[PDB]
Write a structure and sequence with these properties.
Herpes Virus-1; 2 strands; 7 helices; binds zinc ion; mainly alpha; two-stranded antiparallel ribbon; 178 residues; 3% strand; Histone Acetyltransferase, Chain A; globular; 46% helix
Length: 178
């Protein structure tokens, strides 16, 4: 197995996947690495299995259909993996914890949002459809763009949103377009 966490790229107390060479900190993995379970398979492995069991699940889909899906176990897992892929980028630090807003010439968002809040919401099964999760994720970046206005720091929202969107299209097999 790898000797660094797959998400944060640091050493520490790592839990190793039994079916692939990845390792994780307990709370870097999503869901948090399960107490017992030998063997243990990480979220990457669990996602690969879904695909292998139903190869047609990789055919293209319309976003509007994906968003209306109920959060059954496989969709819950896919949103967990998508959230994990965002944490995998170091720039996610900016969006992880609860923000505060006191900048001359700007007003804070009506509905603040952040990664750890989305993580808790998924853990608590608060989303009934994929749309709920995706709306909260996109709200993170939209709030950032609006608040930071013409400051060049707005770009960090564009950057992390692009990671989210690419991974959303991959994980949910959105039909490719120009
Ligand atoms: Zn980690
Ligand atoms: Zn694995
Ligand atoms: Zn099938």
């Amino acid at each position: 197995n790898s000797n660094i966490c797959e998400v944060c790229n640091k050493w520490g107390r790592l839990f190793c996947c039994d079916t692939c060479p990845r390792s994780f900190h307990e709370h870097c993995h999503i869901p948090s690495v399960e107490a017992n379970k030998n063997p243990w398979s990480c979220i990457f492995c669990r996602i690969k299995t879904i695909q292998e069991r139903c190869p047609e699940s990789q055919s293209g889909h319309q976003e509007s259909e994906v968003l209306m899906r109920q959060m059954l176990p496989e969709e819950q897992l896919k949103c967990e993996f998508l959230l994990l892929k965002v944490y995998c980028d170091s720039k996610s630090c900016f969006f992880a914890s609860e923000p505060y807003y006191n900048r001359e010439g700007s007003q804070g968002p009506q509905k603040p949002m952040w990664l750890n809040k989305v993580k808790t919401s998924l853990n608590e099964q608060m989303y009934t459809r994929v749309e709920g999760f995706v709306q909260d994720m996109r709200l993170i970046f939209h709030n950032h763009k609006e608040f930071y206005r013409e400051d060049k720091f707005t770009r960090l929202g564009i950057q992390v949103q692009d990671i989210f969107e690419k991974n959303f299209r991959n994980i949910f097999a959105i039909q490719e377009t120009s």
